[PDB]
Amino acid sequence: TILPLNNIQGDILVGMKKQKERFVFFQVNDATSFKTALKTYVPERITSAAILISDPSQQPLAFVNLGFSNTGLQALGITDDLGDAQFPDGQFADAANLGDDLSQWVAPFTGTTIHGVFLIGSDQDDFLDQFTDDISSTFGSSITQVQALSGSARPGDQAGHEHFGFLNGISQPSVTGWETTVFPGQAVVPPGIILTGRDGDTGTRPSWALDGSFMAFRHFQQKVPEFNAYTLANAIPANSAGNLTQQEGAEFLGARMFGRWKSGAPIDLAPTADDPALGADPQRNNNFDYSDTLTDETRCPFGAHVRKTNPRQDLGGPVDTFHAMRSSIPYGPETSDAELASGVTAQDRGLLFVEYQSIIGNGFRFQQINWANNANFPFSKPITPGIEPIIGQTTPRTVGGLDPLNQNETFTVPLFVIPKGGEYFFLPSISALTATIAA
Numbered sequence: 001t002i003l004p005l006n007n008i009q010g011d012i013l014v015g016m017k018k019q020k021e022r023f024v025f026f027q028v029n030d031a032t033s034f035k036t037a038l039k040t041y042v043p044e045r046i047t048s049a050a051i052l053i054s055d056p057s058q059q060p061l062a063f064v065n066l067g068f069s070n071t072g073l074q075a076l077g078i079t080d081d082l083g084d085a086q087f088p089d090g091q092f093a094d095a096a097n098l099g100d101d102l103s104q105w106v107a108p109f110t111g112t113t114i115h116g117v118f119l120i121g122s123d124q125d126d127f128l129d130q131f132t133d134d135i136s137s138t139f140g141s142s143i144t145q146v147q148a149l150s151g152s153a154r155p156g157d158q159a160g161h162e163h164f165g166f167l168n169g170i171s172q173p174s175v176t177g178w179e180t181t182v183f184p185g186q187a188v189v190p191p192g193i194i195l196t197g198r199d200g201d202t203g204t205r206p207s208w209a210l211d212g213s214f215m216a217f218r219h220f221q222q223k224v225p226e227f228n229a230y231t232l233a234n235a236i237p238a239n240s241a242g243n244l245t246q247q248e249g250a251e252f253l254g255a256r257m258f259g260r261w262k263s264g265a266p267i268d269l270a271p272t273a274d275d276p277a278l279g280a281d282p283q284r285n286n287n288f289d290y291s292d293t294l295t296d297e298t299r300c301p302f303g304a305h306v307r308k309t310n311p312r313q314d315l316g317g318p319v320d321t322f323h324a325m326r327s328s329i330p331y332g333p334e335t336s337d338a339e340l341a342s343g344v345t346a347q348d349r350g351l352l353f354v355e356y357q358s359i360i361g362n363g364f365r366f367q368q369i370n371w372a373n374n375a376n377f378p379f380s381k382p383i384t385p386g387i388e389p390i391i392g393q394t395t396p397r398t399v400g401g402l403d404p405l406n407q408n409e410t411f412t413v414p415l416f417v418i419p420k421g422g423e424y425f426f427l428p429s430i431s432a433l434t435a436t437i438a439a
């Protein structure tokens, strides 16, 4: 098998990796007008995986991808069952299952008003505006923009880091069926873990759904001064190698909560001190599997973010089923000195989170519910791992093992990540956009 890279929406397989991204959420007002506008739009603007791997000079100023919710497909008379258990009812209907405080959800996410999303990746906010206006011009009254959420890479040496300060987008699965570089420690999975209708996908798909994917979108607000204050108060006093200053102990506690230092260095490889060169080295920063820390927490807590969401050898061996592609971007202004000093969030900032998989229940949802929210996961450990401190949602939010010299001590961690909404979308193949969606 050879994946048709020219027909796969690029953010799914390759990732836009643009400095700015905008999610333009819309409702369809008139199906006929929308469909003809869509046929005009697709060949000009929808960006394939092939374009994303092309020379930066062959590339457009902005990349655009497009997904639909269940109600969006219904509004367009696209009535064939896509085979996913969660997609049809939308994410709000699933939010309590995810552990969300529903009182924090806001319109237009609180229901099924959203019909789809244009994802625009570009280099400047002005360019996002140009391509948003282009959507408005092309689609006119056939749509209503119900929300737009815009993100940006953080400035300077924080580019690629999320708002708590940690380098993100390091670990991704590699799919077979195309010519790609595989890094040491990277999962190698069949393409149908990510792409509907391909080998590895067990869902019952219409033929036209080949080479699409499901997006789990989440809007997270982050409480950065609060996280900072917590790590400073609970700074680890020492580790195996020696004694830590308050700053060092706070950085270390954050690293223990995530499973990586802010630099990206995985604690399984760098358990006592940061190694920024390692964090920046794709040939080594994923070359670990917890095999040297399966039954103790000195090297890594059992419940660290990355360990919960990708358990590696905690599962007993490689498992292809539960991998997903991520394409998230931070949003909001930098955290001010006043905010940090006060320990209190004044401004809205966070993460626009995007995860792609063929089966929602096996990717995002499995990572969230079965793993992160489950105090008894990973299984068969000598002590209870607890709730994933970053995004685990079960109460009490107690996690063990954060102090490598006092592993039995538990930490009750305030929730620093607040879901404000989200949706489940299907991104069709590029051909399906015009041959099926717009038919």
Ligand code: HEM
Pocket: 162, 164, 166, 167, 168, 169, 170, 171, 172, 218, 220, 222, 258, 260, 305, 306, 307, 309, 310, 350, 351, 353, 364, 365, 367, 368, 372, 390, 391, 417
């Ligand atoms: C604001 C919320 C979140 C923040 C700040 C955050 C941050 C991070 C960071 C810093 C990493 C390490 C970089 C890497 O290994 O690629 C990471 C990895 C990861 N996160 Fe998150 N994350 C968030 C939410 C989520 C959620 C909700 C899920 C899924 C339910 C998730 C799933 C993953 C996965 C699968 C990895 C890669 C794990 C691996 O392959 O080793 N994250 N995240």
Ligand SMILES: [C-]#N
Pocket: 168, 169, 326, 328, 353
């Ligand atoms: C995590 N992204």
